[PDB]
Design a protein around this ligand. Structure first.
Ligand SMILES: *c1ccc([N+](=O)[O-])cc1C(=O)Nc1ccccc1
Ligand SMILES: *c1ccc([N+](=O)[O-])cc1C(=O)Nc1ccccc1
Length: 270
């Protein structure tokens, strides 16, 4: 591995830690309970939910949702998390050598289709077999509780849990995930791209640094890179299935509005 590539990776790594407050290392120390005797508040039923919701009683009232069904409240708070992560990814993309120089429309297109593939990828970092950290690591909503919600809301997170478990089995660190997320955004296959040639050249570089980094960082996992390539395909499919379930929810649930920023992303996605 050369020096220009070795720096390009650290640069990507740098932008990852600067723009994402909840990295895998922060989460893994919380979940282990080895650096603090004060665990996060656990949400496992409607009771503990209403207790945690009393913390954000201000924004629930502002958004006129404080009185709606419990499933819809979670669906609304989670949209906020997506908006934040989409924003953070928009800033993270600037550190991708060549992304800032692409035409503006192609930047919107790359993010329009990649953000949710990146979200579900990074979402694995805050997940275990029993639940996921929430509110910057101050809460832990249980997997079973999300399954107990009424359909179709109970079908939202479970596939993400299933993906995170298999994804976490690869035992990647933020060093690897950062490059992995960069490759997800720099995909020359996105419908609507104008300068496909430039983006593809930009992707070949990212994917190259990733393949070398994986060999350097995980030498005893010979086919870790092929495994990831298959993980990109699984994420793409996972997002498709997710977008299908959202359109089913937005139409057959007149009570669960859709955030304006996310409406654009989901609009004419596939
Ligand atoms: C963001 C943070 C917290 C809450 N909450 O707890 O009520 C809600 C939101 C939010 O963005 N709600 C929303 C959903 C859809 C359209 C506009 C606003
Ligand atoms: C919903 C979507 C994404 C995340 N996240 O990635 O941190 C979290 C949530 C969520 O359920 N947040 C929450 C916090 C407190 C009480 C209810 C729900």
């Amino acid at each position: 591995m050369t020096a220009d590539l070795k720096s390009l990776a650290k640069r990507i790594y740098e932008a990852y830690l600067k723009n994402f407050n909840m990295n895998k290392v922060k989460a893994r120390v919380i979940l282990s309970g080895k650096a603090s005797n004060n665990p996060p508040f656990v949400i496992h039923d409607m009771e503990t939910l209403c207790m945690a919701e009393k913390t954000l009683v201000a924004k629930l009232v502002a958004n006129g949702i404080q009185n709606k069904e419990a499933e819809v409240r979670i669906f609304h708070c989670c949209q906020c998390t997506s908006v934040e992560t989409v924003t953070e990814l928009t800033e993270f993309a600037k550190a991708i050598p060549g992304f800032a120089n692409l035409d503006l429309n192609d930047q919107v297109t790359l993010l329009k289709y990649g953000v949710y593939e990146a979200i579900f990828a990074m979402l694995s970092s805050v997940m275990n077999k029993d639940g996921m950290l929430v509110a910057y690591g101050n809460g832990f909503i249980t997997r079973e509780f999300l399954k107990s919600l009424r359909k179709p809301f109970c079908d939202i997170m479970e596939p993400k849990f299933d993906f995170a478990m298999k994804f976490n089995a690869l035992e990647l660190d933020d060093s690897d995930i950062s490059l992995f997320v960069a490759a997800i955004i720099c995909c020359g296959d996105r419908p609507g791209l104008l300068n496909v040639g430039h983006i593809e050249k930009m992707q070949e570089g990212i994917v190259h640094v990733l393949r070398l980094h994986l060999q350097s960082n995980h030498p005893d996992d010979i086919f870790l890179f092929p495994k990831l390539l298959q993980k990109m395909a699984d994420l793409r499919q996972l997002v498709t299935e997710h977008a299908q379930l959202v359109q089913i929810i937005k139409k057959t649930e007149s009570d669960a509005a859709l955030h304006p920023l996310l409406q654009e992303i989901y609009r004419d996605m596939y």
